Each structure stands twice: as C-alpha cells, then as structure tokens.
C-alpha cells in the first residue's frame, strides 16, 4: 500500500470545513476528519470507499 496511507490527516491552514476521509493505519480503518480546503496532503479522500481503494 502507498506510504501516504501512514500519514496523519492534515486539516491544513484553510478556513473551510469539509468532511473528508483518511485511512487511520493504527485502527486499520477509514475515518472522517475536517479539511480546511487548502494544501491537501494525500491521505485525504471523498469517501470511506476511496480511502480503502487506496489503503486497504
């Protein structure tokens, strides 16, 4: 699986509040976080299914 699957979720500096998914490798599962809308990192998906397609 890609190494970015091991990154923590990055909310970033932005003022948006957008529900996104990340793969929580410690939990072995997709989870939600709130993304600020700017400067997304790779562990940042539209849906739980997308996070698993990349990281399962």
Element (H, E) at 29: strand 29-35
Experimental structure resolution, Å: 1.9
Third-level CATH fold of 1-56: Factor Xa Inhibitor (4.10.410)
Q: What experimental approach yielded this model?
A: X-ray
Running DSSP on this structure, what letter comes out for residue 54? H
Domain ranges of the chain: 1-56
Between CA 56 and CA 34 the distance in angstroms is 21
**Alpha-carbon distance 28 to 13, whole Å?**
27
CB of 14 closer than 8 Å to CB of 38:
yes
What are the phi and psi torsion angles at 18 (to 5°)? -120, 125
Q: Under 8 Å CB-to-CB from 7, ≥6 apart: which residues? A: 22, 41, 42, 43
Q: Which of 54, 10, 14 is nearest to 30 (CA)?
A: 54
């Amino acid at each position: 699986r890609p190494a970015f699957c091991l990154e923590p979720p990055y909310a970033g500096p932005g003022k948006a509040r957008i529900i996104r998914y990340f793969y929580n490798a410690a939990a072995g599962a997709a989870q939600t976080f709130v993304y600020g809308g700017v400067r997304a990192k790779r562990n940042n998906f539209a849906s739980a299914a997308d996070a698993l397609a990349a990281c399962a």
